[PDB]
Design an enzyme around this catalytic site. Sequence first.
Site, PDB file in Angstrom:
ATOM      1  N   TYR B  57       0.939  -1.190  -0.006  1.00 15.99           N
ATOM      2  CA  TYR B  57      -0.165   0.105  -0.008  1.00 15.99           C
ATOM      3  C   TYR B  57       1.046   1.286  -0.112  1.00 15.99           C
ATOM      4  O   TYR B  57       1.732   1.504   1.056  1.00 15.99           O
ATOM      5  CB  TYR B  57      -0.922  -0.029   1.238  1.00 15.99           C
ATOM      6  CG  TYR B  57      -2.167   1.041   1.366  1.00 15.99           C
ATOM      7  CD1 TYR B  57      -3.159   0.743   0.838  1.00 15.99           C
ATOM      8  CD2 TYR B  57      -1.698   2.211   2.389  1.00 15.99           C
ATOM      9  CE1 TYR B  57      -4.189   1.712   0.796  1.00 15.99           C
ATOM     10  CE2 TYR B  57      -2.732   3.037   2.167  1.00 15.99           C
ATOM     11  CZ  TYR B  57      -3.989   2.784   1.571  1.00 15.99           C
ATOM     12  OH  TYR B  57      -5.048   3.805   1.901  1.00 15.99           O
ATOM     13  N   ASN B 150     -14.720   4.988   5.324  1.00 18.23           N
ATOM     14  CA  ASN B 150     -15.653   4.310   4.553  1.00 18.23           C
ATOM     15  C   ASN B 150     -16.909   5.249   4.237  1.00 18.23           C
ATOM     16  O   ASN B 150     -17.231   5.336   2.938  1.00 18.23           O
ATOM     17  CB  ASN B 150     -16.399   3.186   5.243  1.00 18.23           C
ATOM     18  CG  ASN B 150     -14.950   2.058   5.236  1.00 18.23           C
ATOM     19  OD1 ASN B 150     -14.281   2.011   4.181  1.00 18.23           O
ATOM     20  ND2 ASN B 150     -15.495   1.029   5.906  1.00 18.23           N
ATOM     21  N   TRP B 300      -9.592   6.739  -4.546  1.00 22.40           N
ATOM     22  CA  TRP B 300      -8.771   6.705  -3.684  1.00 22.40           C
ATOM     23  C   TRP B 300      -9.047   7.799  -2.514  1.00 22.40           C
ATOM     24  O   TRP B 300      -8.173   8.906  -3.036  1.00 22.40           O
ATOM     25  CB  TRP B 300      -7.287   6.438  -3.841  1.00 22.40           C
ATOM     26  CG  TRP B 300      -6.234   6.011  -2.820  1.00 22.40           C
ATOM     27  CD1 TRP B 300      -6.838   5.281  -1.581  1.00 22.40           C
ATOM     28  CD2 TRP B 300      -4.907   5.951  -2.700  1.00 22.40           C
ATOM     29  NE1 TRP B 300      -5.588   4.893  -0.951  1.00 22.40           N
ATOM     30  CE2 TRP B 300      -4.386   5.520  -1.576  1.00 22.40           C
ATOM     31  CE3 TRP B 300      -3.818   6.738  -3.580  1.00 22.40           C
ATOM     32  CZ2 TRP B 300      -3.168   5.403  -1.263  1.00 22.40           C
ATOM     33  CZ3 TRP B 300      -2.743   6.555  -3.230  1.00 22.40           C
ATOM     34  CH2 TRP B 300      -2.159   5.803  -1.874  1.00 22.40           C
TER      35      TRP B 300
HETATM   36  N1  LIG Z   1     -10.255   4.877  -1.068  1.00 25.48           N
HETATM   37  C1  LIG Z   1     -10.334   3.431  -1.331  1.00 25.48           C
HETATM   38  O1  LIG Z   1      -9.805   3.281  -2.638  1.00 25.48           O
HETATM   39  C2  LIG Z   1     -11.082   2.760  -0.290  1.00 25.48           C
HETATM   40  C3  LIG Z   1     -11.129   1.158  -0.813  1.00 25.48           C
HETATM   41  N2  LIG Z   1     -11.750   0.319   0.162  1.00 25.48           N
HETATM   42  C4  LIG Z   1     -11.805  -1.083  -0.332  1.00 25.48           C
HETATM   43  O2  LIG Z   1     -13.148  -1.483   0.110  1.00 25.48           O
HETATM   44  C5  LIG Z   1     -12.787  -2.909   0.531  1.00 25.48           C
HETATM   45  C6  LIG Z   1     -13.226  -2.873   2.061  1.00 25.48           C
HETATM   46  O3  LIG Z   1     -14.445  -2.342   2.538  1.00 25.48           O
HETATM   47  P1  LIG Z   1     -15.022  -2.368   3.836  1.00 25.48           P
HETATM   48  O4  LIG Z   1     -13.806  -1.654   4.233  1.00 25.48           O
HETATM   49  O5  LIG Z   1     -16.219  -1.573   3.444  1.00 25.48           O
HETATM   50  O6  LIG Z   1     -14.776  -3.925   3.939  1.00 25.48           O
HETATM   51  P2  LIG Z   1     -15.467  -4.952   5.007  1.00 25.48           P
HETATM   52  O7  LIG Z   1     -14.013  -5.928   5.450  1.00 25.48           O
HETATM   53  O8  LIG Z   1     -16.280  -4.365   6.046  1.00 25.48           O
HETATM   54  O9  LIG Z   1     -16.307  -5.866   4.056  1.00 25.48           O
HETATM   55  C7  LIG Z   1     -15.718  -6.416   2.706  1.00 25.48           C
HETATM   56  C8  LIG Z   1     -17.162  -7.288   2.190  1.00 25.48           C
HETATM   57  O10 LIG Z   1     -16.498  -7.734   0.869  1.00 25.48           O
HETATM   58  C9  LIG Z   1     -17.150  -9.126   0.546  1.00 25.48           C
HETATM   59  N3  LIG Z   1     -16.180  -9.692   0.115  1.00 25.48           N
HETATM   60  C10 LIG Z   1     -15.067 -10.510   0.335  1.00 25.48           C
HETATM   61  N4  LIG Z   1     -14.501 -11.123  -0.618  1.00 25.48           N
HETATM   62  C11 LIG Z   1     -15.459 -10.985  -1.677  1.00 25.48           C
HETATM   63  C12 LIG Z   1     -15.652 -11.594  -2.928  1.00 25.48           C
HETATM   64  N5  LIG Z   1     -14.493 -12.454  -3.515  1.00 25.48           N
HETATM   65  N6  LIG Z   1     -16.774 -10.985  -3.801  1.00 25.48           N
HETATM   66  C13 LIG Z   1     -17.653 -10.376  -3.276  1.00 25.48           C
HETATM   67  N7  LIG Z   1     -17.601  -9.736  -2.215  1.00 25.48           N
HETATM   68  C14 LIG Z   1     -16.380 -10.282  -1.287  1.00 25.48           C
HETATM   69  C15 LIG Z   1     -17.633  -9.500   1.898  1.00 25.48           C
HETATM   70  O11 LIG Z   1     -18.713 -10.375   1.787  1.00 25.48           O
HETATM   71  P3  LIG Z   1     -19.693 -11.098   2.534  1.00 25.48           P
HETATM   72  O12 LIG Z   1     -19.937 -10.490   3.853  1.00 25.48           O
HETATM   73  O13 LIG Z   1     -20.923 -11.275   1.718  1.00 25.48           O
HETATM   74  O14 LIG Z   1     -18.825 -12.349   2.712  1.00 25.48           O
HETATM   75  C16 LIG Z   1     -17.608  -8.166   2.827  1.00 25.48           C
HETATM   76  O15 LIG Z   1     -18.981  -8.110   3.108  1.00 25.48           O
HETATM   77  C17 LIG Z   1     -11.557  -3.270   0.088  1.00 25.48           C
HETATM   78  O16 LIG Z   1     -11.240  -3.550  -1.019  1.00 25.48           O
HETATM   79  C18 LIG Z   1     -10.903  -1.943   0.648  1.00 25.48           C
HETATM   80  O17 LIG Z   1      -9.565  -2.137   0.302  1.00 25.48           O
HETATM   81  C19 LIG Z   1     -12.388   0.946   1.379  1.00 25.48           C
HETATM   82  C20 LIG Z   1     -12.494   2.369   1.785  1.00 25.48           C
HETATM   83  C21 LIG Z   1     -11.721   3.162   0.776  1.00 25.48           C
END
Ligand SMILES: NC(=O)C1=CN([C@@H]2O[C@H](COP(=O)(O)OP(=O)(O)OC[C@H]3O[C@@H](n4cnc5c(N)ncnc54)[C@H](OP(=O)(O)O)[C@@H]3O)[C@@H](O)[C@H]2O)C=CC1
Lengths: 364, 364
Positions: B57, B150, B300
């Site tokens: 990162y 978020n 981002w």
């Molecule tokens: N500025 C930016 O670019 C930002 C990027 N992000 C990105 O957003 C994501 C993290 O979000 P939060 O932080 O909201 O995340 P959380 O960890 O809270 O949730 C992640 C979710 O993604 C799901 N998930 C995991 N693997 C898969 C897959 N293969 N296909 C579909 N869904 C999947 C899960 O599904 P389930 O519960 O159904 O299993 C879960 O609900 C990351 O990619 C993070 O790096 C976040 C904030 C800012």
Amino acid sequence: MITAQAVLYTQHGEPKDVLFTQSFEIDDDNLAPNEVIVKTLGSPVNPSDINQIQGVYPSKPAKTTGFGTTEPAAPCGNEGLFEVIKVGSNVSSLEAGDWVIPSHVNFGTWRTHALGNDDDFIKLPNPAQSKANGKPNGLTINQGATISVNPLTAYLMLTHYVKLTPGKDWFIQNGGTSAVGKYASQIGKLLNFNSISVIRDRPNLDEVVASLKELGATQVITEDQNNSREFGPTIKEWIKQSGGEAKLALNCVGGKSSTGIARKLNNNGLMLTYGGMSFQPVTIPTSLYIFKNFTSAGFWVTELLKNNKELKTSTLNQIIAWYEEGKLTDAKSIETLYDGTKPLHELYQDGVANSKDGKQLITY
Amino acid sequence: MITAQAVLYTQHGEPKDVLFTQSFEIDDDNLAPNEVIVKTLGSPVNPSDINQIQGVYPSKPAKTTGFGTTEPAAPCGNEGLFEVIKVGSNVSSLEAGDWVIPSHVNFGTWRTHALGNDDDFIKLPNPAQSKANGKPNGLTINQGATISVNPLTAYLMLTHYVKLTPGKDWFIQNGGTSAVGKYASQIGKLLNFNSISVIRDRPNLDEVVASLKELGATQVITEDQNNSREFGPTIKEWIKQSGGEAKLALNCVGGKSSTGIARKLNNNGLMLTYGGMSFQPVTIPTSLYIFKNFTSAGFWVTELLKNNKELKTSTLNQIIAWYEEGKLTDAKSIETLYDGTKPLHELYQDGVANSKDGKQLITY
Ligand SMILES: NC(=O)C1=CN([C@@H]2O[C@H](COP(=O)(O)OP(=O)(O)OC[C@H]3O[C@@H](n4cnc5c(N)ncnc54)[C@H](OP(=O)(O)O)[C@@H]3O)[C@@H](O)[C@H]2O)C=CC1
Ligand SMILES: NC(=O)C1=CN([C@@H]2O[C@H](COP(=O)(O)OP(=O)(O)OC[C@H]3O[C@@H](n4cnc5c(N)ncnc54)[C@H](OP(=O)(O)O)[C@@H]3O)[C@@H](O)[C@H]2O)C=CC1
């Protein structure tokens, strides 16, 4: 009365299967006041013409019984150069002998003649006129016949989306040996943009490299170099050491190649996808979008210019001027002359089947 | 004197391997004029925090010996909620008891306390202050601790790139159950934007679907439906009846999912890739860029708000306002309280390991 031949199809499919030659008559003694009869000098076989026939291109001529077929049939080819044979009583924009290209796509250029309105064509200066106007050079048949698609594509992609600082900035493109790629290289040289052309390796690599540099590419690398982690820093030095940045990528291949050129751009880079010769989708690592603020977009010259005759005219005049000034050369073509001994549609089926050898142009 | 603990690493790696806890002291008696001491109330484990520790990162704390280690070590965590305990003789922006979040990323929020300058923090209203202003609600620890990443990400993606016509237009997003996805649904309904959330199928599908619609999703479909040509017309009908268009796609999954949501946008659509949880690249068919004039870009929040205090402030205020009014609810967290019996770093390692269970928040 003139007897003409047109390459048609009653249904979409592969050119090798669905094309045929239809003989038809054009009444040159009874032209409506605004009509014109032109005789084809040459028209090329472009990938989009093929996709159009295959039915996987969202822009095509309507099928009609106009050429005298029992079932509705559509003509083929979207660009080409024609010589005006006769104009109706109210035509002033054109006259006998003039060189013209269709003013719009879907006119059908794979044929010996065509009857249309004066506004269905755009006049290009022909050699006789260029000389009389005191110009150093005049257009060749191939230059006129391929002036509508590839040169304007290269010009617009390089100037209409992101401003590259002359003497500093760069664009990178794959499909470096493509006609569009060759036009991009020259236009880059003329506008003083630096550029990297990516091509597939070949036994005569050195010769092609020198040839592309003569045209205007600053650097030429192979796809293997494009994919190389180890070679990557050398490419970055070219850009860094020039004082400019790689701001634009031109992609007509797709797949791994598209991934490779995108990774070469500086942050906030833009990639224009205008072709997919590998038949592989555009694949971009998530990291490029997030950490390098990369943007991936598309380019379709047909759509960009269909209701913007102004941009089209301005672009076309610049190409014509460079051709007349001897500052631009054409992506050369393998020419096949129609003489009536071999059905016209077969000359085009051959051009389609031999596309891999390079741009095909059927002449008359 | 105050004995504090901080989760650090001396080399990048997996959290389970390189993290450790460092005890350090803060002299609450010797504060410079502009210094402030705060104690942590809570801080989350976000994917970016982990990627930062892993070294993949491109935005991170400098390694220093500031926590009393002999070899340079970097702190962890980029967002969190703290309570001001003491301020210097020249601090007027903050008072003891105030609630604050770091003003910039890379501050290190996985720790019990921090000494900093007043400008290293941004004041949020604490419950007593919200209450004294007659607001229906005060912020909770989780709401304050997870407000920087978020919620702002969801807000800015829905409003900063393309304008959706309220009551008409649609956005489509994958990762529907993610914290960000839950914020986007809520912000979408609050701004009167229509939306489709894509989630992976599960046995309790009905319950998850109902839950997302309550949060604000207009429709919820599975990835299988996203993959479905048969289902395609159903989505298109939803959009048609609304009288709007699908103009924006939010992608945090990558792979087939990113391809599927891109395909459902109307022509001239825009997709923002902000995550890639499937670890697969963004793949887009050549035809979408050329014929549908689709655009694929990145997002981002860290880079966007880096040098844009005004945009950050404005977005942050709108989120605080919705929380105070009760109109927005937080993506809930699984909380683990640090009480000094289990090393702080282990609480975060467990948080990292149990990520799939849902957002983890370490409280103090
Ligand atoms: N500025 C930016 O670019 C930002 C990027 N992000 C990105 O957003 C994501 C993290 O979000 P939060 O932080 O909201 O995340 P959380 O960890 O809270 O949730 C992640 C979710 O993604 C799901 N998930 C995991 N693997 C898969 C897959 N293969 N296909 C579909 N869904 C999947 C899960 O599904 P389930 O519960 O159904 O299993 C879960 O609900 C990351 O990619 C993070 O790096 C976040 C904030 C800012
Ligand atoms: N969107 C638009 O407005 C326009 C799009 N185009 C697109 O550009 C392409 C055709 O260009 P021109 O018409 O300039 O083309 P040409 O037929 O002159 O050149 C085609 C090129 O593609 C290369 N190529 C063929 N197969 C592959 C492969 N499998 N992997 C990598 N490269 C390959 C050739 O390589 P080599 O030299 O090694 O044989 C050659 O450089 C098409 O994709 C066409 O549809 C063109 C004009 C406009």
